[PDB]
Design a protein around this ligand. Structure first.
Ligand code: K
Ligand code: K
Ligand code: K
Ligand code: NA
Ligand code: NA
Ligand code: NA
Ligand code: NA
Ligand code: NA
Ligand code: NA
Length: 739
């Protein structure tokens, strides 16, 4: 049974790291971006929006939203490829793949690779790893991580094998002692740049450069179309090349280097040019690494203006304070100017005007504090690209958004360029928790990096992230079910930089304004929080490992330890009885009936394994009525957790929530991301779990989604589902069910 639905994103706009930008060099108006956890997009200029291309990716192949590299075919501009896969350690159970499309990513074919890829690993801002030969589109190269070396396809990306003659698989490892495998992987072969001049169309390009993450040997080349390879003689040492771009008009290679792989660091590095004709390397760094006093950054975001290839740009990788710097040269690197300069301290002259009218929350809840701007130009600007058909258009990514200008050449004439977010249709947040209260705002969200929002209108970008306090990352939100103006949120931030602020905070006006009391010592992460049905008391399991579960009678006025419940348990409140709280920890279920003061175990040997951890939740209006989502099934208790029953027909559930009952039912509608009849997706039941209807489809899957889910108690059929890198999606009924 299926039901047609309409799916949309809650309006936020960007919110994550956009770590590559690829224009097609073959025809105008063809532009793609990649993200680390949130797929890739194509720019739709007619409608002024980004179109997501990988939302067909689901739970079975969820790593494919980790986009390692994009190549765009300049001979047949309908063609585009992507390298995909998210981690190279145990955290992604699947190998990566090369995806190919002949309709600009509307549809794709998949070739899995025999090894994992690192879309969300260290070094992900380096690239592009994947490249198409601009003289023969049958031929592609891919620089692989993990010591897999350099790969090639000679059938336009359908099949791949290793170039076993390539002499250096990479040596650089960010932290070889990391036993999780996250920092300890070889970063590998990091970009391929063709010399289009080195052949005529219809014949493979003979001269190929390859960037390698090996500070002693950062660049290799071939002159015979890959039959033989050598280190480019005289290549500079000591740094990893984030970027390599060839200019076949003047016959030079440009590289931008840093002492780390990025994307969060980089404290020294250089920009160099290599002349094919003379063999001469020329250092062209705006601030050279040999100027140890002043060079506090490496370099990345390397781009050439293809209409005027003496024009090149680069960005600091990385300058945290006072802001990033973006540099421009209109003479091949001989001289540079910058996007801002010191005048006399803390004053600066700016070559730009930054307008965040469409994305006002980008101040991150903080006023400008000279010399520090708010909003900032950016940070983690590994990606930057001038449009190869329009010198005035340039984009650059940051850790939180994508910025663009359409008047770039005003820079050269002594004016200010105009920069603004370019994120319509691009939603890249990672969602930890969601509530839809029965009065006030429709939706309050707990998000990675932004903290979260009170969303007055899910179609309108909010004005501000949560403030007083600002959270770096929101982990949990709740409301008092019978006093729904009372809201509680918990979250994560470094205490040393916010000592007046707390990791748990409150509102009595439905999330419009917040306030805070106290907290236990040593809290840095949010964990889970639960509000009593009357809003008079709260039970909180702070996030740091081993923090005792605590309760407050009041708004965090003061906290005392809850007896009988393990640190870091998942805490929920009953939606009816203001003195009843529940917890789940390592297969044991606990209940308190004295408002969180004491808990006792009431069931055990329960599910502890789930795709987003085991989730459970209490039902509005039904005392003691609990639903629990786990890898082995969806389970239901009607006696406060003392006993549980499998819901027949659901083989697995990621998460469960509730919304407004159907006409003629007095039970809330139940929504799950789960598996029914061998099909994983979103489902709603209007009769208390007896029957289920599928409410999404195979084009609307969103990968590892379901960390958060809630229905809307004011809108029958409406569901809000958190994703991990595609923001908050929501669904409405758009038709009658099939049966
Ligand atoms: K949107
Ligand atoms: K040039
Ligand atoms: K609700
Ligand atoms: Na990220
Ligand atoms: Na490895
Ligand atoms: Na730095
Ligand atoms: Na256990
Ligand atoms: Na236990
Ligand atoms: Na009803």
């Amino acid at each position: 049974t299926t039901q047609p639905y309409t799916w949309s994103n809650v309006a936020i706009g960007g919110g994550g790291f956009v770590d590559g930008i690829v224009f097609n060099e073959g025809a105008p108006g063809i532009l793609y971006v990649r993200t680390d956890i949130g797929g890739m997009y194509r720019w739709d200029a007619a409608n002024g929006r980004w179109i997501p291309l990988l939302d067909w990716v689901g739970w079975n192949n969820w790593g494919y939203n980790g986009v390692v590299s994009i190549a765009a075919d300049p001979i047949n501009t309908n063609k585009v490829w992507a390298a995909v896969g998210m981690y190279t350690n145990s955290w992604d159970p699947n190998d990566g793949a090369i995806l190919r499309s002949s309709d600009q990513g509307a549809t794709w074919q998949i070739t899995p690779l025999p090894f994992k890829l690192g879309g969300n690993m260290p070094g992900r801002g380096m690239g592009e790893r994947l490249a198409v030969d601009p003289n023969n589109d049958n031929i592609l190269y891919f620089g692989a991580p993990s010591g897999k070396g350099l790969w090639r396809s000679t059938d336009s990306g359908a099949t791949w094998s290793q170039m076993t003659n390539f002499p250096d698989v990479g040596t650089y490892i960010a932290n070889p002692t990391d036993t999780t495998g996250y920092q300890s992987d070889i970063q590998g072969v990091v970009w391929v740049a063709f010399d289009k001049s080195s052949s005529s169309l219809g014949q493979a390009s003979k001269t190929i450069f390859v960037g390698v993450a090996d500070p002693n040997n950062p660049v290799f080349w071939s002159r015979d179309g890959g039959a033989t390879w050598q280190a480019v003689p005289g290549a500079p040492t000591g740094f990893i090349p984030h970027k390599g771009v060839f200019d076949p008009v003047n016959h030079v290679l440009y590289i931008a280097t840093s002492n780390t792989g990025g994307p969060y660091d980089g404290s020294s590095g250089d920009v160099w040019k290599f002349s094919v004709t003379s063999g001469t390397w020329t250092r062209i760094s705006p601030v050279p690494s040999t100027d140890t006093a002043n060079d506090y950054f490496g370099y990345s975001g390397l781009t050439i203006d293809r209409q005027h290839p003496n024009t090149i740009m680069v960005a600091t990788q990385i300058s945290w304070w006072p802001d990033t710097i973006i540099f421009r040269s209109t003479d091949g690197g001989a001289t540079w100017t910058r996007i801002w300069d010191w005048t006399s301290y803390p004053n600066r002259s700016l070559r730009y005007v930054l307008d965040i009218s469409a994305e006002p929350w980008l101040t991150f809840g903080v006023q400008p504090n000279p010399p520090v701007p708010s909003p900032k130009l950016g940070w983690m600007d590994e990606a930057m690209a001038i449009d190869p058909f329009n010198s005035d258009r340039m984009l650059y990514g940051t850790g939180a958004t994508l910025y663009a200008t359409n008047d770039l050449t005003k820079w050269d004439s002594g004016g200010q360029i105009h920069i603004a977010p370019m994120v319509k249709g691009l939603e890249e947040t990672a969602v930890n928790d969601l509530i839809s209260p029965p009065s006030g705002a429709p939706l309050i969200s707990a998000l990675g990096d932004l903290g979260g929002f009170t969303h007055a209108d899910v179609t309108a970008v909010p004005s501000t992230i949560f403030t007083s306090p600002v959270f770096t990352t929101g982990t949990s939100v709740d409301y008092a079910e019978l006093n729904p103006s009372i809201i509680v949120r918990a979250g994560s931030f470094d205490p040393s930089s916010q000592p007046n602020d707390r990791h748990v905070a409150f509102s009595t006006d439905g999330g419009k304004n917040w306030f805070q009391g106290s907290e236990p010592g040593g809290v840095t992460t949010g964990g889970t929080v639960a509000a009593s049905a009357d809003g008079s008391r709260f039970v909180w399991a702070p996030g740091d490992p081993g923090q005792p579960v605590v309760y407050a009678v009041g708004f965090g006025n003061s906290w005392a330890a809850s007896q009988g419940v393990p640190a870091n348990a998942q805490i929920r409140s009953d939606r009816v009885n203001p003195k009843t709280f529940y917890a789940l920890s390592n297969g044991t279920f606990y209940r308190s009936t004295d408002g969180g003061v004491t808990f006792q175990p009431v069931a055990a040997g329960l599910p502890s394994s789930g795709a987003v951890g085991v989730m459970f939740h209490a039902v509005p209006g039904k005392e003691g009525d609990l639903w629990l989502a786990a890898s082995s099934g969806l389970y239901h208790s009607t006696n406060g957790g003392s006993s549980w029953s499998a819901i027949t027909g659901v083989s697995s559930a990621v998460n469960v929530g509730f919304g407004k009952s159907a006409p003629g039912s007095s039970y809330p509608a139940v929504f799950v991301v789960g598996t029914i009849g061998g099909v994983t997706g979103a489902y709603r039941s209007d009769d208390g779990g007896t029957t289920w209807v599928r409410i999404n489809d195979d084009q609307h899957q969103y990968g590892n989604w379901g960390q958060a889910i809630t229905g809307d108690p004011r809108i029958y059929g409406r569901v809000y589902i958190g994703t991990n890198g595609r923001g908050i999606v929501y669904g409405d009924i758009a038709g009658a069910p099939s049966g």
